[PDB]
Design a protein around this motif. Sequence first.
Motif, PDB file in Angstrom:
ATOM      1  N   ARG A 123       1.533  -3.617   6.730  1.00 36.48           N
ATOM      2  CA  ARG A 123       0.243  -3.033   7.132  1.00 36.48           C
ATOM      3  C   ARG A 123      -0.708  -3.232   5.956  1.00 36.48           C
ATOM      4  O   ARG A 123      -0.372  -2.914   4.802  1.00 36.48           O
ATOM      5  CB  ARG A 123       0.392  -1.534   7.409  1.00 36.48           C
ATOM      6  N   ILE A 124      -1.889  -3.768   6.259  1.00 33.94           N
ATOM      7  CA  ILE A 124      -2.904  -4.020   5.235  1.00 33.94           C
ATOM      8  C   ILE A 124      -4.052  -3.069   5.513  1.00 33.94           C
ATOM      9  O   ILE A 124      -4.493  -2.982   6.653  1.00 33.94           O
ATOM     10  CB  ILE A 124      -3.429  -5.480   5.264  1.00 33.94           C
ATOM     11  N   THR A 125      -4.506  -2.351   4.495  1.00 33.51           N
ATOM     12  CA  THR A 125      -5.715  -1.543   4.675  1.00 33.51           C
ATOM     13  C   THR A 125      -6.742  -1.910   3.598  1.00 33.51           C
ATOM     14  O   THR A 125      -6.392  -2.399   2.520  1.00 33.51           O
ATOM     15  CB  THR A 125      -5.415  -0.036   4.637  1.00 33.51           C
ATOM     16  N   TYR A 126      -8.019  -1.727   3.913  1.00 31.47           N
ATOM     17  CA  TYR A 126      -9.045  -2.055   2.934  1.00 31.47           C
ATOM     18  C   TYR A 126     -10.294  -1.244   3.222  1.00 31.47           C
ATOM     19  O   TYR A 126     -10.613  -0.941   4.365  1.00 31.47           O
ATOM     20  CB  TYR A 126      -9.376  -3.557   2.930  1.00 31.47           C
ATOM     21  N   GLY A 127     -10.999  -0.892   2.163  1.00 30.88           N
ATOM     22  CA  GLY A 127     -12.274  -0.195   2.310  1.00 30.88           C
ATOM     23  C   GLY A 127     -13.054  -0.269   1.019  1.00 30.88           C
ATOM     24  O   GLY A 127     -12.494  -0.580  -0.025  1.00 30.88           O
ATOM     25  N   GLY A 131     -16.854   4.413  -1.083  1.00 35.55           N
ATOM     26  CA  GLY A 131     -17.807   4.377   0.023  1.00 35.55           C
ATOM     27  C   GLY A 131     -17.493   5.427   1.072  1.00 35.55           C
ATOM     28  O   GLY A 131     -16.326   5.707   1.344  1.00 35.55           O
ATOM     29  N   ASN A 132     -18.531   6.018   1.659  1.00 33.32           N
ATOM     30  CA  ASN A 132     -18.376   6.866   2.848  1.00 33.32           C
ATOM     31  C   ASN A 132     -17.898   6.006   4.016  1.00 33.32           C
ATOM     32  O   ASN A 132     -17.768   6.455   5.160  1.00 33.32           O
ATOM     33  CB  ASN A 132     -19.703   7.555   3.202  1.00 33.32           C
ATOM     34  N   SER A 133     -17.632   4.753   3.665  1.00 36.78           N
ATOM     35  CA  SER A 133     -17.402   3.663   4.583  1.00 36.78           C
ATOM     36  C   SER A 133     -16.023   3.804   5.238  1.00 36.78           C
ATOM     37  O   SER A 133     -15.102   4.379   4.653  1.00 36.78           O
ATOM     38  CB  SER A 133     -17.501   2.357   3.783  1.00 36.78           C
ATOM     39  N   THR A 159     -10.983  -1.554  -2.242  1.00 34.64           N
ATOM     40  CA  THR A 159      -9.598  -1.196  -2.493  1.00 34.64           C
ATOM     41  C   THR A 159      -8.755  -1.739  -1.346  1.00 34.64           C
ATOM     42  O   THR A 159      -9.094  -1.494  -0.179  1.00 34.64           O
ATOM     43  CB  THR A 159      -9.458   0.342  -2.600  1.00 34.64           C
ATOM     44  N   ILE A 160      -7.703  -2.480  -1.685  1.00 35.73           N
ATOM     45  CA  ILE A 160      -6.866  -3.156  -0.697  1.00 35.73           C
ATOM     46  C   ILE A 160      -5.432  -2.673  -0.912  1.00 35.73           C
ATOM     47  O   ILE A 160      -4.946  -2.657  -2.049  1.00 35.73           O
ATOM     48  CB  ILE A 160      -6.936  -4.675  -0.925  1.00 35.73           C
TER      49      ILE A 160
END
Length: 184
Positions: A123-127, A131-133, A159-160
């Motif tokens: 599982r890959i997450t990124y943001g 960020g309020n993103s 951040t990944i």
Amino acid sequence: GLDSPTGIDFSDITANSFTVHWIAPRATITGYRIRHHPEHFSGRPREDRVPHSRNSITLTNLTPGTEYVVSIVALNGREESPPLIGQQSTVSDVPRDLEVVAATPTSLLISWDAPAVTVRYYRITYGETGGNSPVQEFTVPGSKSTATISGLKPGVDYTITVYACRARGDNPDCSKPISINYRT
Ligand SMILES: [Ca+2]
């Protein structure tokens, strides 16, 4: 005093188990008491009482990537031996060496190394870092340790994170994640 067992040995090591072996003392014994705990854990060890005819036990439900302290005590009725102690780690299920290998103004190619377990999917997450993103997620098959992240903004810190997930029980069993930061 009651002589200790000797020759602690380990076999069949996995991410969640290993088998412990020992040699009986040259003494009369009525049983063994085996304790195990993750190193540095401040609480109660797990405990198993093992028959005097036995010289091994498979410990299960262990945490991956963890060094355990295992203590084996011979018993003779009331008396106990000093413990025979060994330290053995389980296999880690966490990916390693996560890095961005290439970048365009709105995409990043990431790569990592598989853990030494059978991975069903990553599982890959990124943001955006800070960020309020919205954090975004996707998967890649467990046979592949690369991914391309698209649709990013140029000039932004991201951040990944990558998790290795196995599919054995009621929920997928996902590793602790590994993370990096990268500015596009
Ligand atoms: Ca240690």
